[PDB]
C-alpha cells in the first residue's frame, strides 16, 4: 500500500546511557514515508492518510468545557513518576493553558496563563455531563508571581506556557511549566528575542465537598534556559523554540528524575547545515537527495529537537542538561510537547507537529508523531513504516493545508481538529480543538476534543500503532475525558494512592465516615485511625 519512494532509514533501537552524546535522527528519508503512505487518488476534502494512523473525525458541533468562560488549549493531568493520572480526595484535577474569551483565539499565545479544572472522580465518561462536567477553578498564579525569575523586568508580555504537574502523597503539586517573557515594541516587533524558561512552582490541593482550591504557587524557581551547545538560543535564532517540560522516572534508572522538552538544534540560524545522517538515505537509493541540494532548499531553517535533562536533587529544583535525544534537522521546526511513555520494555517518545512546519520537500498531517527504542536515549525507530506518524488529523496531502484561520478550499475540514495531543495510560489520547470546518464555514475550538484510543504495538510489533475505532462512538470517547487511574487520599501529612478498584472498595467499606474525612470535617481519633489503616492496606 505504499507509493514508490525512498526506503526509510535503518534504525537499530539500541540504547545508550542517558548521559551519552548519541542523538537519534528523524531523517528526511523517514519523513518521506508520510508521502508514500498517502493515497494520491483521494479527492477534494477527503482524507488521504491511512485510517489506522488518522484520528477519528471530530464533529463540528462540539460542547465547550468551560461554558465559554475562557479559551482552553494545552492541558495536562496530575501525574506521578510513572505518568499515572491522579484524583485527590475524590476530585480529578487538570491544568490548562487558558486565555480570556474576549481575545481572538489566535492572539492567545502572548496572553496565556495556566488555569485548572476539577470534577468528581470515578464516574464513567458516558455518565458524565456532555461537556465532561469540569468546573473551572480559575488561574493558578496571582498577578506578577511568574514574573519573579526575570532579571529584565521591562517585558511587554509575560505568559505561562505548557508543562506537566507531579503530585506528592501529601497533596503537594510540583507544577513544571514554561515561564516566558516578551520584549516587544507597540508595533509588535522585538526589542530583543523572547525569553522562555523551564520553571517550577509548588502548591497544594485543598479539597472538600464543594470542590478544589489550590494553595501556594507563591514562588517560582528558574530551572533551565537554552544553553547554545545542545539547545538553540535567542542569539542563534530570534524565534528559537524552548518549552514544554515533561518529567518522569525511567524504569531503567530507578531513583533518578528526567525531563524531556522541546528545543531546536544549537546552530546559528544562518549557518545551520544538514549532513548525510540527517538526510538518512540508504546508500544508492535512486530517491536519495544530495546534502548540497537540501542545504540550498531552505530546509536548514527547520531544525527542531527534543531535549533531555536530569534532576540533580530530590526537590527537583536543580537540573543539568543532557544531549538531545531526537533531532529533526531539515525535517521540522517543531517537535512539540514531547513525552516518554513506557510499554513492554520500550521507550516511546511521542511529540506533536504541524503540517506547515515541515521542511521543503516534506509534508505530513497535523498531529502525533512517535518513536520507539530500547532506552530513553536510543537509536529511535520512527513508528509505522519509519514515517513517525502515530495519530494524524484527517488530511488530504494532495491539497494545500491552509491555516486554522483560513481553511483551504479543497482540504479535509478536520485538518486542524486537534492539537497538543497528550498520550495517557492505556493509549488514550486527549487533545484540544483548534478549527473544524471548511473555508466558508468553520469554527474555532478552544476546548478539548473527544478522547480517542490508540493501540500501541499492534500484532506483536512494537513499531506499529492503530487507532481503535471500536472505542466509544466510532473511535470518539468522552468530551474532555482525562481520567485518573490512581486516587490519592490525603489528610494532615498522611497520604496513600490506590487503584480504581481499591478506591471503590474503600468507599464501600467506610461509607459515610469517609465522606466527612474527605470534606475536611473533624472526625474522632478512632475513625481517623480506621481510615488510615484501610488506606495503608491498599
UniProtKB/TrEMBL annotation:
Site described as Transition state stabilizer, positions? 244
Under the heading Gene3D superfamilies, the entry gives: Glycosyl hydrolase domain, family 43
> What's the gene?
bff
Binding-site residues, Ca(2+): 268, 333
Instruction: Please identify the protein, giving its name as recorded.
Output: Beta-fructofuranosidase
CDD domains membership? GH68 (cd08997)
Q: Recite the UniProt keywords alphabetically.
A: Calcium, Hydrolase, Metal-binding, Signal
Recorded GO molecular functions are: hydrolase activity; levansucrase activity; metal ion binding
Q: Where is the active site?
A: 74 (nucleophile), 336 (proton donor/acceptor)
**What biological-process GO terms show up in the record?**
carbohydrate utilization
Report the cofactors.
Ca(2+)
Residues bound to substrate: 73, 162, 243-244, 334-336
Task: Please tell me the species this chain comes from.
Answer: Microbacterium saccharophilum
Amino acid at each position: 500500500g505504499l507509493q514508490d519512494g525512498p526506503e526509510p532509514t535503518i534504525h537499530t533501537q539500541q540504547a545508550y546511557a542517558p548521559e551519552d552524546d548519541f542523538t537519534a535522527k528523524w531523517t528526511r528519508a523517514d519523513a518521506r514515508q508520510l508521502q508514500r503512505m498517502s493515497d494520491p487518488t483521494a479527492p477534494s476534502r477527503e482524507n488521504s492518510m491511512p485510517a489506522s494512523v488518522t484520528m477519528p473525525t471530530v464533529p463540528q458541533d462540539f460542547p465547550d468545557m468551560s461554558n465559554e468562560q475562557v479559551w482552553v488549549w494545552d492541558t495536562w493531568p496530575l501525574t506521578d513518576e510513572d505518568a499515572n493520572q491522579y484524583s485527590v480526595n475524590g476530585w480529578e484535577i487538570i491544568f490548562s493553558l487558558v486565555a480570556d474569551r474576549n481575545l481572538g483565539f489566535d492572539d492567545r499565545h502572548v496572553f496565556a496563563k495556566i488555569g485548572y479544572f476539577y470534577r468528581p472522580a470515578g464516574v464513567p465518561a458516558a455518565e458524565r455531563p456532555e461537556n465532561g462536567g469540569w468546573t473551572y477553578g480559575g488561574l493558578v498564579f496571582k498577578e506578577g508571581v511568574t514574573g519573579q525569575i526575570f532579571e529584565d523586568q521591562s517585558f511587554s508580555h509575560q505568559t505561562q506556557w505548557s508543562g506537566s504537574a507531579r503530585v506528592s502523597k501529601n497533596g503537594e503539586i510540583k507544577l513544571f511549566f514554561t515561564d516566558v517573557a516578551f520584549y516587544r515594541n507597540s508595533d509588535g516587533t522585538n526589542i530583543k528575542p523572547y525569553d522562555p524558561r523551564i520553571a517550577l512552582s509548588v502548591g497544594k490541593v485543598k479539597a472538600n465537598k464543594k470542590g478544589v482550591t489550590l494553595t501556594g504557587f507563591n514562588k517560582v524557581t528558574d530551572l533551565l534556559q537554552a544553553d547554545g551547545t545542545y539547545y538553540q538560543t535567542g542569539a542563534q535564532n530570534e524565534f528559537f523554540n524552548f518549552r514544554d517540560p515533561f518529567t518522569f522516572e525511567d524504569p531503567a534508572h530507578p531513583g533518578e528524575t528526567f525531563m524531556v522538552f522541546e528545543g531546536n538544534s544549537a546552530m546559528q540560524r544562518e549557518t545551520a547545515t544538514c549532513n548525510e545522517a540527517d538526510l538518512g538515505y540508504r546508500q544508492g537509493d535512486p530517491y536519495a537527495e544530495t546534502v548540497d541540494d537540501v542545504n540550498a532548499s531552505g530546509a536548514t531553517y527547520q531544525i527542531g529537537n527534543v531535549g533531555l535533562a536530569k534532576a540533580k536533587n530530590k526537590q527537583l529544583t536543580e537540573w543539568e542538561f543532557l544531549p538531545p535525544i531526537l533531532s529533526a534537522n531539515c525535517v521540522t521546526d517543531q517537535t512539540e510537547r514531547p513525552q516518554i511513555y513506557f510499554k513492554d520494555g520500550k521507550s516511546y517518545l511521542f511529540t506533536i507537529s504541524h503540517r506547515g512546519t515541515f521542511a521543503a520537500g516534506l509534508d505530513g498531517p497535523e498531529g502525533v508523531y512517535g518513536f520507539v527504542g530500547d532506552g530513553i536515549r536510543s537509536d529511535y525507530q520512527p513508528l509505522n513504516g519509519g514515517s513517525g506518524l502515530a495519530l494524524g488529523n484527517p488530511t488530504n496531502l494532495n491539497f494545500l493545508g491552509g491555516q486554522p484561520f483560513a481553511p483551504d478550499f479543497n482540504q479535509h475540514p478536520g485538518h486542524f481538529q486537534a492539537y497538543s495531543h497528550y498520550v495517557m495510560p492505556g493509549g488514550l489520547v486527549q487533545s484540544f480543538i483548534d478549527t473544524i470546518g471548511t473555508h466558508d464555514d468553520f469554527v474555532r475550538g478552544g476546548t478539548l476534543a473527544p478522547t480517542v484510543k490508540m493501540d500501541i504495538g499492534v500484532g506483536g510489533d512494537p513499531t506499529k500503532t492503530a487507532v481503535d475505532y471500536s472505542y466509544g462512538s466510532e473511535g470518539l470517547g468522552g468530551w474532555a475525558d482525562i481520567p485518573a487511574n490512581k486516587h490519592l487520599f490525603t489528610n494532615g501529612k498522611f497520604g496513600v494512592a490506590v487503584s480504581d478498584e481499591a478506591a471503590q472498595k474503600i468507599r464501600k467499606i467506610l461509607g459515610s465516615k469517609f465522606d466527612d474525612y474527605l470534606d475536611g470535617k473533624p472526625v474522632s481519633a478512632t475513625v481517623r485511625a480506621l481510615i488510615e489503616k484501610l488506606l495503608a492496606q491498599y
